[PDB]
Amino acid sequence: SKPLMPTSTILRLLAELVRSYVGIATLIANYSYTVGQSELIKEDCSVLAFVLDHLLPHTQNAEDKDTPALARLFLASLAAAGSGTDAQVALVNEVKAALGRALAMAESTEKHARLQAVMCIISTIMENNIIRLFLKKGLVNDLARVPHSLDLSSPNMANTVNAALKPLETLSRIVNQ
Amino acid sequence: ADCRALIDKLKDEQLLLELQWVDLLDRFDGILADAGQQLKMLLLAVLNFTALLIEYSSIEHLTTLLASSDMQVVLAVLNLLYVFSKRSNYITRLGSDKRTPLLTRLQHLAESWGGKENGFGLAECCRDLHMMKYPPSATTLHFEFYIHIEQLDKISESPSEIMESLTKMYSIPKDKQMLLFTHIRLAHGFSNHRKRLQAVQARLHAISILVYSSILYNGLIEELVDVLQITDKQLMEIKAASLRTLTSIVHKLSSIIDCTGTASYHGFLPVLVRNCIQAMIDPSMDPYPHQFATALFSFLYHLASYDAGGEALVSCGMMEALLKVIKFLGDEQDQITFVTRAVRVVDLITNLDMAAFQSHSGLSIFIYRLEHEVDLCRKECPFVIKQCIPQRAALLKSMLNFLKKAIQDPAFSDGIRHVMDGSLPTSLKHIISNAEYYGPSLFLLATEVVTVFVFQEPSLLSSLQDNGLTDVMLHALLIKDVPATREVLGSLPNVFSALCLNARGLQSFVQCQPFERLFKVLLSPDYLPAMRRRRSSDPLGDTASNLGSAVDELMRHQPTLKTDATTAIIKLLEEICNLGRDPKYICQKIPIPLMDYILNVMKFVESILSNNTTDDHCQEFVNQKGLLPLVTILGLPNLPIDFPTSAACQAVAGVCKSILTLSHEPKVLQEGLLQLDSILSSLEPLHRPIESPGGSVLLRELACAGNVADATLSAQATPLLHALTAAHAYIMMFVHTCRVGQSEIRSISVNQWGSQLGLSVLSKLSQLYCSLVWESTVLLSLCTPNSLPSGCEFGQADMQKLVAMAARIKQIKPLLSASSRLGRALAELFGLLVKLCVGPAARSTASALTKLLTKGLSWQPPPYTPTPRFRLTFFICSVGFTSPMLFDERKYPYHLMLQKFLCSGGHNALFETFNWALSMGGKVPVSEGLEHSDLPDGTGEFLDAWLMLVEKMVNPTTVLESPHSLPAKNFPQFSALRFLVVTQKAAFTCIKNLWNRKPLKVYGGRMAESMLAILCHILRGEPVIREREQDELHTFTDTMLPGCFHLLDELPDTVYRVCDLIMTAIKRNGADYRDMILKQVVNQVWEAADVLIKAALPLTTSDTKTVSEWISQMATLPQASNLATRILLLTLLFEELKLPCAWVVESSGILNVLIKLLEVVQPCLQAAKEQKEVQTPKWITPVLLLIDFYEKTAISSKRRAQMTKYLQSNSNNWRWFDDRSGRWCSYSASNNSTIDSAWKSGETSVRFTAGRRRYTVQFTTMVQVNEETGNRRPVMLTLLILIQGLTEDMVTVLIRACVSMLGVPVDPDTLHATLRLCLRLTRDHKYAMMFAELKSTRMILNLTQSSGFNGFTPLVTLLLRHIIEDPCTLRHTMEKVVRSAATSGAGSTTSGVVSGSLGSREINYILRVLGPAACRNPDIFTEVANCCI
Q: Which residues cross the membrane (chain A)?
C-alpha cells in the first residue's frame, strides 16, 4: 500500500537525469511551486527551496528513511552538472536564502536540523565555480555570522556551530592556500 | 551451607543484619519497591549487608532512592553501585531504560563545585572553616533551564516538600528535577559539617562509579591528595572514598604519581603506607582503620598493575615495607587479608624488578610465612603421609603462585637450589597429604610448584626423592583418591613426567601400578562432573582428550610405560564390556552412566593412538588384543536403543577409523564383521514371517513380552530390538571407516568386504534390509488410524495384546524408529561400498549389491497382505535406494553396477514393477490401468520415483560420458550403448502406456515431467545410437501433439519440457514438420483468442451480469487458461527457432489478433479497477513477451542481414586483439574458419586449440578465454525471411494498452512485461512521446508497493530516459559519451588495461565499448562519431 516511488527514489532519479541531461538542471532550478498545490506548501517557493527546507533536514519521525541522503545527492548533482551558470547560481542563491531564513527562524530543533543540513550540503558541494560563487555571494560571511543568530545556551548550538565551521575550514583553506 | 542457615535464620530482621539467595533478595527488592515510593534504618541495613553479598530488579528502586533527604541511604546506594561497578560490568551492559536515569543522577551528584580556585576545595569542604570562610554562594540555590535563592536557612524545614512546592510554584522540567533536588539538599547541607562531608563523600562515590563505567579536572587529584593529608583523623571514611576515587581514576597517572609522591621514599603516600603498616604490626601504635588500609592496599595493587606505578613502587622501596608486613603480621583473618594483598602487590612489582625482593631475602620471608601458615593448619589437620580457613587458603594460593613464578624466573636460576633444602618441601608435603582440608586447586599449585622446580633443576629430583616428597606425591595422586577436577586430571601426567625423570623415580612410579589407579577416573561417577564439557562449547570429552594427549606425551618420553598403559586401557575396555553385559546394570541417559564412560574412554584412547601419528600405540594395542574389547562395545546388550546415533558410537567408530588409517590394518574390519555376523545370525526369526494373518515380528515379540511396563529397556524383553541396535552401531562404524579417501584404505576395505565373511555379512544385510522395509511399513500401517488397512486383523491381534490408540502407538514408535534408522544406515553403507568398489573382489561386492537391488525390486509380500500399498511402499524405497547405487551425484552411472544390474537382473524386474503397478497384479491391462478408477493410492508416487530413476538410466550424455567407465579389454565386456538400446526400448512402451491418459491427483506433474524428459532423451539418443525402431519414434512424433496439448491444459508447468520435446522432434524431422507444429500451435492460439474477442463485446443487452461475470469470464474462461500456455509454448519455440517461427507468426497475422485482444480487454480491466476487484488475466504476460521477442527478433534479423551484406561468406576473417601491441592478429586458417562456421551456425560458443593452449570464444560477448589461465581477450570479425516488424498501427495500440494496464495496476509480473515492451517500443522517441502524452508518469508515480518488482526502478529510469532523449539531447549526450570514451582509456572485462594508450584507444575497440550507444541509436552514433572522432 506504500507508494512504489518514494521521494527518495524520485530524488535519485532526478539526480541521474540532472547528471546526464543539460536542460534538466535549468528547468528544475527555474521551476517553482504554487500556493495550495500540496499540503506541505504554504507559498510560492522554488523546488530547491523546498528540498533545502522540508526534504533535506533530518526529522525524528520517518516518512521515508533516506530522503536526506538523496536530497543531498540531488543538490550535489545539480551543482556538479556544469549547466553554465543557470543552475549553479540558482542553487547557491537558494541555499543562501534558506540559510538566512533558518537563521531568522525561531529557536527550535527544527532550526538546528535545517541549519545542520544546509551546512552539510554546502560541505558536500564544496567537496571551483561553486567556490567562486560562495565568495561572490558572501556565503562564508553569512556562515561566520551564524552564532549571532543563535541562542548560545541551546543544547544544539554547539552541534550547529560545528557544522557551520566544517565548510568554513575547507573554504578558508582553499582560498588562502 | 551456612549461607542457607543464615537465610533460614533471617527468614529484629534489621538487628540480625546489624549483627552481620533468591527469595531473600526478593524480600529485599520488596522493601526497596515499598520504601522509595522503623523503615529507613531497615533499608540501610538491607543495603549495608547487600554491599557485602555482591562482593562475595533492585536497580529501578535504587535509582528512585537517590531522591532521599537523608544522605546516609544515598551513600549506601552509592557504596552498593561502587561494589557493582568495581567487581562486574553489571551496570555497564544494562540498557538505557534505567542506565541513563542512573548515570544522570550520578552526574548531577558528581559535577564540580568550583574546586580550590573558587574556595570549594574538598580539603576546605572537610575542615569546618567556621562556615564564614566559604564563598557566600554556598548557602544559595541557582537553578536554571529561573530559580535563585539567596539563603536556605529561613525555610530549612522539609527540603523534599520544598522541591514539591517548587513543583507547584514553577513548572520544573520533566524528568530533570533531580538536579534541583541535589542542589537544594546541598545548600541545606553546606550549613553543617556532617551533611557537607556526606555530600563530599557522595560526590567521590559518584566519580568512582562514573570512572569504573567533564567531571574530571586539573585540581581534582590535588584536592583528593589534600583530603588524604587532613590530619583530624575523623575523616578516614572520606579518605577511603578519596583513595577509591583515585583507584577509579587509575583505570592522569603521572599526575597521580607526582602528587601522591610515590616516586620517592619520602612522600605522602609512601609515608602514610609505612605508618599504616607499622601500626598494623606493632600493638602499641593504634591501627589505621581496616577500611582505609584496604583502600590503600587496593590502590597499591591497581597502581602496581600499571608500569608507571610498578616503577614508582620500585622507586619508593615499598617492597621492604610489604615484606615487613608479610614477615611480622599476626594470624587474625583481617591481618591475613592484608598479607594476601601485600603478596599480590609483591607479585606485580616482581613482574618487573627482582633485585629488591632478592636483596630483602623475600623468598625466605615467603617460605617462612608458608611455614607459619602450614604450622597453623598442622594443628587443625596434623596428618602427613608417613577445613582450611578461606583467607589462609587465598594467602597460600597467591604465595605458591609467586613461588612458581619465581622458579620460572631468572635472578633465581642462580640459587634456587637452596629452596628445596629449606622447610618448603616439609610444608608442601602437608598440602599434598591433605588435599581434602586444603582445596584441590591448592593441591594442584603444590604439585605444579614441584613439577616446575624439577624441570628447572632435574638434578635435585634426587634430593626430593631422598626426602620423599615424590613418594608423598605418588601416594596423594594414585593411592589416595585424586581430587576430582579438570585441572588436577589435566596435570597428573605432567607430574609423572617429572617423577619419572630420574629413572629411580620411574622405577617408583611403575612399582605402584599407576595406570590401574589413574584410569579408574574414567569409570567413576565421582569424576564425571570433571569430565563434562566446560562452557557447553568445548568438545564432548575434551578433558579426557587432554588427559589422553598428556599420557601420550608422558609415555613417549618414557616408552617403558607404553606396555602398562595399553594394558590398563584394555582393562578399561574389558570392564566396560562387563558393565554392558550383565543384566543387573541399566544404562541411564541400577542406573549406570555407561554412555558417558564410553565417550570419555574413547576420547582418551583416540587421543593416545592418534596424537603422534607414529603408529606405535596402535600397533601395541592391536598386538595386545585390544580390538576385540573395543569392537564388542558396540554390541553391548544394556546399551540404550538411541546409542547408535550417539556421539559415543561415533567415538568408537572414530577410534576404529584412527586405528585403520594409522596401522593400515584390516583387523578392525575383520573383527567388526565377525561380531556383526554373530549378531545377524541371532535375528533370522526376523526374516521368517508370521506365516498366518499376522503383522510385525517385532510387535509380536513386544506384545508377547508379558505385561512389563517398559520391555524396550531389557535385553531379554526385546532381543531382536537390541540386536537391531547393535547391528546399527556396527554399521555406523563401517560407514565411518568407509568415508575415507586414502586409496590404500579403500583397497583394504574392499578386500575385506569381498571376503567369504564379507559377502556372508553383505547377503545377510540385504535380507535384513528387505525385512526392515517390511517391518517399518507394517508398523506405520498400524500407527495409521485405521485408514490404510482394509478393516482386517492383520496386526490387530498383537496390538490387542500390546494395549487407547496412542497407548499402542507409543509402544510401537521405538520399534519404528529402531527399524527405519537402521534401514537408512544400511542404504548409506551400500552407497559407500559402491563408491569404494568403483573408485576383482569389488566385482563380487557389486554382485551381492545388485542381487540386493534385484531382491528389492522383485520382493513380493506374504499372500496375507490386506492391500498392495505395502508392496508399492516397498517398491518406492527400493527404487529410491537403487538410484544412489547405480548413479552418482551429478547422475553419472557406475558401469560395473549397470553391467551387473543388467546381467544379473533388476532391469526386467524394474520394468515388471511398472507393469505390475499399473495392472494391479494382472487384474487390468497396463493400457487401461492408469485411467482405472480403482488404481491404488500410492501408484502415482511409485511412478514418480520410477520415472525419476529411468530419466537417469536413459540419458546418453551421462551414460556414455560417465567418468566411471570400465577399462578397455575373460569377462563379458559392458556396452553402455546396448544398455541404452534395451533401456530406451523397454521405457518407450511404458511411456506409451502413460502418454495420453489423464494425470493422477498428486504426483502427476512430476510423472509428466520425467516422462517428457525420458522422451526427449530417447529422441536425442536414437540419432546417436543408430550410428553404432525409428519408424515408431516417427509415428510418435507425428501423433504426440494431441497429448502435449492435453498436458498443457491439465498441467501447464510441464510446458518447458514440452518445448524441449517438440524441439527434439523438430531436430529429428524436417521443416515440413516444423511448419505443421507452428501452424497448429498458431491455430490453437487463434481460436482461443478469437473466442475471447467475441467474449468482450460491450454488454449492451445485459443478458449476463456484465460486471462480475464479464470481468472474470475474460480471466477464467477455459480459453483464457489455454492461451497462458499456447502463447508461452509458442514463445519458447520462438526463442529457439528464431526465424522460422517469426515468419510464421508474421504470415498468420496472429499478432494483429493479439493486439486487438490487448485493446479489447482494456475496458474490462478498467471496469475491474472500478469494481475495486482487479484479478489480472494470466494470459496477458505471455502475449507481451511474445510481442517483445517478435520485435527483438526482427531488429536482429535486419542488423544481421545488413551485416551479411558487408561480409564475404568465404573465410570471414576473425581476429583476436593484442592489447599490448594493439594488433588485431589473425587466427590460423583452421581456427578462423571454425569460428566463422560456428558463428554462422548460431552456436553460442566455440572451442579450439592453438599451440596446444585451449581457447574458447563467447559470441555473446565476443571474447576469447584461455581455458588454462582464464585470460579474456577481445575478438572481432573483420568486415570488408525478412521480418517486417511491428507496424505503427500496432505499436500505437500496444502503447495505449500498456498505459491502461499501468492505470489499473494489473499485477507485478504483468507490469514488468508491459514495461519491458514499452522500453523496447519507446526507443523510438515518437512512441516515447506517445507514452508520455498519455499521462503514464502519473500512474507510475501512483503505483503502490503491492505492484512492484525487482527491476522496477532501473527499468522506469530507463523508460524516463527514453522519454527525455529527443534527437538533439541524445546527440549531445552521445557526444559526451564518445568524447569520454576516447579521452579515457576505459577498462573492460576483456583484460583491456585500465587507462591504456594502445589497447584502450583503438577505434576498433572503442566502437565495441560504445556498442550500447550505437544500439541506442546507430544513425546518431554515426553522425556524432564522424564529427567528434
A: none
